[PDB]
Design a protein around this ligand. Sequence first.
Ligand SMILES: CNC(=O)c1cc2cccnc2s1
Length: 118
Amino acid sequence: SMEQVAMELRLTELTRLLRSVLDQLQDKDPARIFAQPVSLKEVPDYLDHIKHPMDFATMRKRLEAQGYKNLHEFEEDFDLIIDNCMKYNARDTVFYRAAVRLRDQGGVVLRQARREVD
Ligand SMILES: CNC(=O)c1cc2cccnc2s1
């Protein structure tokens, strides 16, 4: 149907917009602290602490699979990255401070993405 095609076109362009947003957000993490899943080899008990792990690479995989239906779902995943980090790591760590900076600096980027979506 033309309708299903039209939807897939919207979804494809949403994916295109979110891809840009993802690249911008990841630029706010120059140290690549949030680039990959927390290694269960380097941190074997992590899953006892964090029930829903998230990272930029995992977000990217979902993105290219067009697994984000709207911005809210995308923001959910970004928020997990930040919130997980700030629970697992203590306040006076390079990890926690990185999350804070990503949170603050990403707020700008998501504020406009929200408008560009409507
Ligand atoms: C988002 N990444 C984290 O919260 C990490 C925490 C720790 C702790 C020790 C060694 N490596 C890592 S990575």
